[PDB]
Amino acid sequence: FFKQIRSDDNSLYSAQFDILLGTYCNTLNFVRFLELGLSVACICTKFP
């Protein structure tokens, strides 16, 4: 409870606020090994 406004009513006219000016995320560059320049040295072969 607060009555202290005896129609003296200051601080009733403030409108300061906070704003979120945006968000920024990144992405991961999924690298494929067989697209490199190194993959010429090994004979890759899957083997389950």
Added chain:
Amino acid sequence: TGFHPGIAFTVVRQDRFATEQLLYAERASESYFVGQIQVHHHDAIGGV
């Protein structure tokens, strides 16, 4: 020490009770002239 020095006193005290009174007034028992609302202004803490 409980000795009665041949003199007597008459005590007086005054009380105060809250009442509920019952007014009566006859018809047209008062002539009432009304003026004109005038407005004056002045400064105070914070506001006018």
